[PDB]
C-alpha cells in the first residue's frame, strides 16, 4: 500500500516568517506576520529573572529601541510593544513581504501538529507532533529553540497554533497559543511544575489500526465485537481516554473504506490491550501508536 | 534532554522547484533547476507500456510540443529533450527564479535523507528515511507520487540524492538518483522484482544508543565490554551489518561527550540482541532504531 510515517506538512511558508528576537544578552525566536512580530515574553529575562519574574515591572524598563529584530543579515525598526499574555507583540516598521495567508488557533488535546524547530531565527527542522490530553508536548527542543511555531496547513492558509517556551522535570514541552495563553496549567516561571497523568488517544489508536489494515497488515483483526460501554470499562483500566459517538462518527470514513465496524475495531483493540502484542509488529511498531488522527491516516493513506 | 523524533529537514528551498509534467494522459511531479525538468522517463508510458517499454522506441514518437510543463497555474515552453538513464531532461525556455545552490550526489547505503512527497506538482508533507543496505527505502507514496525527490541540505546548498519510481512487491519503495540510476538492481518496467534480504545498520543502531544516554535513558548500560571481532560474531547471527574501524572512528563525537566506549556500548547492544528489551522502552521505542546516522543524532542532541 502507501506504507507509513510520521508526515510533517512543507514548513517554506513558515520558513519565511522567523526572525531572531534580542533584548539585552537574551535571544530567541520570534515570528513575523504583516508589520507585528510575536515571541515568548521572557525574552526580556536575564539568568536571574526567570525564578520568580513580575513581568510587568520588567517590561516597564524596556523601550522599542531596546529590542533587536533581525532578518537574515537585515536590521527591522520596533516601533510599538505590548504584552498578550505570556506573548510579546512587536510593531515593526516593515510588512513581512512573504506574510501568508493565515489563522491563530487554539488547538484540542488529541489533534496533531508540525513544528519547525529554529535556533537564531533560522530553520533546523520540522517534525509532526501531538497535544497530549494533559496540554504537554513529546518535542525535540534545545537551548535557544523558543519562540519557534507548530502550525497545519488547510491549503493556502496556515493555522499557527503553538509557541514553545519550556521543558518540564519530565523532559515533556509545554508553550501557548499565539494569543499568549497556555496549554495546561503551566506559567513562565522556573519553578518545579507537573503535569497531570497522561492517557491515551484512544481515537487516534484506532486510526492507526485502520491505516495497518489498509497496507494489508491485518495479523490482529480478531473474530470479536463489543459494545461502547464494554469497551470503555477496560478502556479506563488500561489509562485510554473514553470512546464517545462523537469519535465513532470521525471514524466513519475509515470505517467505510475498510468495510470493519468500529466496534468491531474496538473488540481487537480490547483483545491487543489484555494479550498485548507477542513479539509482533503492527506497522513496524511494537506498541500501539496514538499521534496520527482520523484525519491524518485519511490524508496519507487515501490522499 | 532535547527529547528525540524523526526530524526533517526545511523543505521550502525544494518546494520552489516542483513542477506538474504531462505526457498524453500520463502526470507526475518533475524538478526545475535553471532551464532544466528532471522527471522518471516513463512519463511517456501508458498503462500498457509499462510491463515491458523499449523507452528509446517511445520517446522517438514524442516531440518537445507533446511535454506539456506546469508551474502553478503557468505554462512552461520546452525547447529541447533528452533521456539520461532512467531519467528525462527537458530543456525549458525560463531560469527558475526561485533555484538554490544545489548539487547532485548518490548517496551510500545506511545515510539518510528527508523526502517531499508531491502530487501533480504540489507538495504534500515531508519524512525522514534511510536508504536500507539492498538499496529500497520504507516511503510513504501513492499513486502520482512519481518524480517525488530525496534531498540533504548542507546549509544555504541542497545536495539532492533520489527520485521516487515504484514500490515493490513487498511495499517498499525503489528509484534512482538525479542522473537517472536506479539505487539497487531494479529496472523500471512492472516485472516482480526482488531485494535482497535487508539487514540492520548496527552503526546506527549505536548512534541511537547514545542519543538514549544523552537524553538520561542509561537502564541498558550493562557492566561489560566486548571485542570489535566478538561483537561481529554476533551481529552476523542476528542479521547486522558488521561493524569496523571507521564506524569506530565516526561514532568518536558520542563516545566524546558520554565518556563510554564504543566497544562498551557494543557490549550493551549485544545483551539487548540476546536478551532482548524484556518490556521495557529505549526513547520510547519498543523496538531497536537504525534510521539515525551518527550525524543526525549530533544535530538534533547537541546543535
Ligand atoms: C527557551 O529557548 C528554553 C527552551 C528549553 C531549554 C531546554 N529545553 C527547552 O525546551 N526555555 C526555558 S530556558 C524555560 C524558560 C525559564 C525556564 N525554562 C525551562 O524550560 C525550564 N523549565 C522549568 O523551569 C519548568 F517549569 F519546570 F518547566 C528548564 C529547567 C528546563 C530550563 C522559562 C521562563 C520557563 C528559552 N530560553 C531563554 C528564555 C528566556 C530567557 C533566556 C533564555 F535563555 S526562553
Ligand atoms: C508513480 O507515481 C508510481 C508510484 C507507485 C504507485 C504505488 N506506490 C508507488 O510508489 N510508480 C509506478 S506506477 C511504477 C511504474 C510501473 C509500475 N510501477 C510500480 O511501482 C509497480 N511496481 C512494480 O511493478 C515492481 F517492479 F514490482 F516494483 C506497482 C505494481 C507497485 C504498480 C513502473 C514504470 C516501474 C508512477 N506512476 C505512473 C508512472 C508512469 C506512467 C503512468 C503512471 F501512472 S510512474
Ligand atoms: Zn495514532
Ligand atoms: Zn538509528
Not at 508589520?35 to 529575562?45: A, G, N, Q, T
Not at 499565539?178 to 487516534?204: C, K, M, S
Given at each position: 500500500?502507501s506504507?507509513?510515517?510520521?508526515?510533517?506538512?512543507?514548513?517554506?511558508?513558515?520558513?519565511?516568517?522567523?526572525?531572531?528576537?534580542?533584548?539585552?544578552?537574551?535571544?530567541?525566536?520570534?515570528?513575523?506576520?504583516?508589520?507585528?512580530?510575536?515571541?515568548?515574553?521572557?525574552?526580556?529575562?536575564?539568568?536571574?529573572?526567570?525564578?520568580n519574574?513580575?513581568?510587568?515591572?520588567?517590561?516597564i524598563?524596556?523601550?522599542?529601541?531596546?529590542?533587536?529584530?533581525?532578518?537574515?543579515?537585515?536590521?527591522?525598526?520596533?516601533?510599538?510593544?505590548?504584552m498578550?499574555?505570556?506573548?510579546?507583540?512587536?510593531?515593526?516598521?516593515?510588512?513581512?513581504?512573504?506574510?501568508?495567508?493565515?489563522k491563530?488557533?487554539?488547538?484540542?488535546?488529541?489533534?496533531?501538529?508540525?513544528?519547525?524547530?529554529?535556533?537564531?531565527?533560522?530553520?533546523?527542522?520540522?517534525?509532526?507532533?501531538?497535544?497530549?490530553?494533559?496540554?504537554?508536548?513529546k518535542?525535540?527542543?534545545?537551548?535557544?529553540?523558543?519562540?519557534?511555531?507548530?502550525?497545519?496547513?488547510?491549503?493556502?492558509?496556515?493555522?499557527?497554533?503553538?509557541?514553545?517556551?519550556?521543558?518540564?522535570?519530565?523532559?515533556?514541552?509545554?508553550?501557548?497559543?499565539?494569543?499568549?495563553?497556555?496549554?495546561?496549567?503551566?506559567?513562565?516561571?522556573?519553578?518545579?511544575?507537573?503535569?497531570?497523568?497522561?492517557?491515551?488517544?484512544?481515537?487516534?489508536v484506532?486510526?492507526?489500526?485502520?491505516?495497518?489494515?489498509?497496507?494489508?497488515?491485518?495479523?490482529?483483526?480478531?473474530?470479536?465485537?463489543?459494545?461502547?460501554?464494554?469497551?470503555?470499562?477496560?478502556?479506563?483500566?488500561?489509562?485510554?481516554?473514553?470512546?464517545?459517538?462523537?469519535?465513532v462518527?470521525?471514524?466513519?470514513?475509515?470505517?467505510?473504506?475498510?468495510?470493519?465496524?468500529?466496534?468491531?475495531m474496538?473488540?481487537?483493540?480490547?483483545?491487543?490491550?489484555?494479550?498485548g502484542?507477542?513479539?509482533?509488529?503492527?506497522?513496524?511498531?511494537?506498541?500501539?501508536?496514538?499521534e496520527?488522527?482520523?484525519?491524518?491516516?485519511?490524508?496519507?493513506?487515501?490522499?
Amino acid at each position: 500500500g502507501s506504507g507509513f510515517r510520521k508526515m510533517a506538512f512543507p514548513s517554506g511558508k513558515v520558513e519565511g516568517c522567523m526572525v531572531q528576537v534580542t533584548c539585552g544578552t537574551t535571544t530567541l525566536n520570534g515570528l513575523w506576520l504583516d508589520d507585528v512580530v510575536y515571541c515568548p515574553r521572557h525574552v526580556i529575562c536575564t539568568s536571574e529573572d526567570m525564578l520568580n519574574p513580575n513581568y510587568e515591572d520588567l517590561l516597564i524598563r524596556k523601550s522599542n529601541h531596546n529590542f533587536l529584530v533581525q532578518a537574515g543579515n537585515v536590521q527591522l525598526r520596533v516601533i510599538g510593544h505590548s504584552m498578550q499574555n505570556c506573548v510579546l507583540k512587536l510593531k515593526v516598521d516593515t510588512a513581512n513581504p512573504k506574510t501568508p495567508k493565515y489563522k491563530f488557533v487554539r488547538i484540542q488535546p488529541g489533534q496533531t501538529f508540525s513544528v519547525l524547530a529554529c535556533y537564531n531565527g533560522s530553520p533546523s527542522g520540522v517534525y509532526q507532533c501531538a497535544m497530549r490530553p494533559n496540554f504537554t508536548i513529546k518535542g525535540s527542543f534545545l537551548n535557544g529553540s523558543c519562540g519557534s511555531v507548530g502550525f497545519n496547513i488547510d491549503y493556502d492558509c496556515v493555522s499557527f497554533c503553538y509557541m514553545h517556551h519550556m521543558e518540564l522535570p519530565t523532559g515533556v514541552h509545554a508553550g501557548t497559543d499565539l494569543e499568549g495563553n497556555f496549554y495546561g496549567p503551566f506559567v513562565d516561571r522556573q519553578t518545579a511544575q507537573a503535569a497531570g497523568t497522561d492517557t491515551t488517544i484512544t481515537v487516534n489508536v484506532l486510526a492507526w489500526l485502520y491505516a495497518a489494515v489498509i497496507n494489508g497488515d491485518r495479523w490482529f483483526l480478531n473474530r470479536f465485537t463489543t459494545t461502547l460501554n464494554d469497551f470503555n470499562l477496560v478502556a479506563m483500566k488500561y489509562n485510554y481516554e473514553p470512546l464517545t459517538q462523537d469519535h465513532v462518527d470521525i471514524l466513519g470514513p475509515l470505517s467505510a473504506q475498510t468495510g470493519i465496524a468500529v466496534l468491531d475495531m474496538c473488540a481487537s483493540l480490547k483483545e491487543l490491550l489484555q494479550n498485548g502484542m507477542n513479539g509482533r509488529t503492527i506497522l513496524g511498531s511494537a506498541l500501539l501508536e496514538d499521534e496520527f488522527t482520523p484525519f491524518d491516516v485519511v490524508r496519507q493513506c487515501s490522499g
